[PDB]
């Protein structure tokens, strides 16, 4: 069994990391972007079932909700699907301000790692990708926002997910992508 | 106290890492790009005050100076500001050629981690972001350049910065973004 | 001497890592992109000779070959060159489908780390970059593809590369960039 750390009330294994590709540092309100994100087993313990969670957070306003953006994704080689608003955590409000909306992006990966019983085990060195399509509705903006990739794992076969709407009873290392939702930079020269 | 390694006579804690988002691999001279960069406490020691440093480096020429580019930044949810040329290191000249221009991008983060006395403590798992607007003047080019993100920390409360013009008496893990400054690639097909 | 783990019968040192800059999450068939990728020594053991390997992989088809894309690269401040198809591994076919084409992108870096004898030693904290130009021929597509950065090292000076066509008898930590080859996302709103 692997070593867990505690963060808030949850168990975190830093050996399950996540990487982003193609997140722009500025997103235009109303426009659709596609990026990729994948979590990888940098440890020696094979997890029996895994799935990605994504957290969308605005630091400078607290009114953003799941319905304020459109979110589609595809697990590795499987087909695209719309992210399910019922597979989300309720909005969380940090003590310093803002709001984050955590979304579950789990499911079979097209027969690369996934098994007939539906699990997506993560042997060492292996990875699972979500290709993600994201768009924020027009008229909403943020000057310091981010996406966090939160890998979710089931520690033992037949474990239950611990956060309502998210995948996993233990979690991997949070990965960040900071951006602004608004207008691009004016010329400095 | 955390474990430091010595590198070029400075104290480095590899548990304070940095990530880049949105850096292009080719930058057009004269054009403004915006990217984000953030440092994260991946260790268990909470630093009492922290700030980011950025190094702009050209490997194939040594004539670049701070005056050859315009640089603005914004710490997390604080306001945009112009980077201060007096809050920069003197040009450094590696033995193999080229020049590094080390720039301090510190300050309050808009009250997320920062405190009324101006300090930015970095608890574990926490991060601080700089949104960065950058443009190199027209007529300057480089075929192998990069930005290095150098997190700076004050190890104990009331410590003084050790590199004149930069923030910190100890430093985090150097993170790199390599790019060309010049023209994009012609179509290979 | 460093600690190796075994992976598919090869020796891997996770302290030699790789990072990507500017890989887009969607690449258009026929269009040329340029990105950079660099491997960094995050350990304390200096390797006497190093070189990057790049793997192009399609998960959803197995007919892709080295001839189906154009690949040029440049080691740090050395000159651009075309990747040599004879310095490639034979196509590898995972049992679950798809194909991987592993390509050697080694050589001197313009005298930054490289020495007159042609070797590229990698001291601690140091790094080697490849600027990469990549284009897939028109009419070929993939819904889940990626680039893997496989650092190659020689553990000892008189060691020989262990995979025909790739650099190294030991290898670093695999780094991934997942993308689709095809059309960008249509508007969700
Ligand atoms: C209540 As609303 C403006 O977040 O859809
Ligand atoms: Cl956009």
Numbering used by the authors:
A (entry chain C), B (entry chain A), C (entry chain B): 9 to 197
What is the paper's account of this structure, in its own sentences?
In this work, we report the identification and characterization of a small enzyme AvmM that can catalyze the construction of a 16-membered macrocyclic ring in the biosynthesis of alchivemycin A. We show through in vivo gene deletion, in vitro biochemical assay and isotope labelling experiments that AvmM catalyzes tandem dehydration and Michael-type addition to generate the core scaffold of 1. Consistent with the apparent molecular weight (66.2 kDa) determined by the gel-filtration analysis, AvmM was characterized as a homotrimer, with each monomer adopting a jelly roll fold. The overall monomeric structure comprises of eight main β-strands arranged in two parallel four-stranded sheets, and three small β sheets. Using the DALI search program, AvmM shares low structural similarities to some components of large proteins, all of which adopted a jelly roll fold. Additionally, AvmM has a long C-terminal loop, which interacts with adjacent monomers to stabilize its quaternary structure.
Consequently, the structure of AvmM was determined by SAD phasing using a Se-Met derivative crystal, and the resolution was extended to 2.09 Å resolution in a native crystal. The overall structure of AvmM-2 complex is highly similar to the AvmM apo-form with a r.m.s.d. value of 0.18 Å for 574 Cα atoms. Furthermore, analyzing the B-factor of AvmM structures indicated that the loop1 and loop2 in chain A are highly flexible, and clear deviations of Y15, K16 in loop1 and E104, H108 in loop2 were observed by comparing chains A between the apo and complex structures. Reviewing the apo crystal structure of AvmM and MD snapshot of AvmM-3 complex, we observed that the C25 carbonyl group in 3 forms a proton relay mainly with H152 and Q184 in chain A and S135 and E134 in chain B of AvmM, as well as the amide of 3 with Y15 through hydrogen bonds.
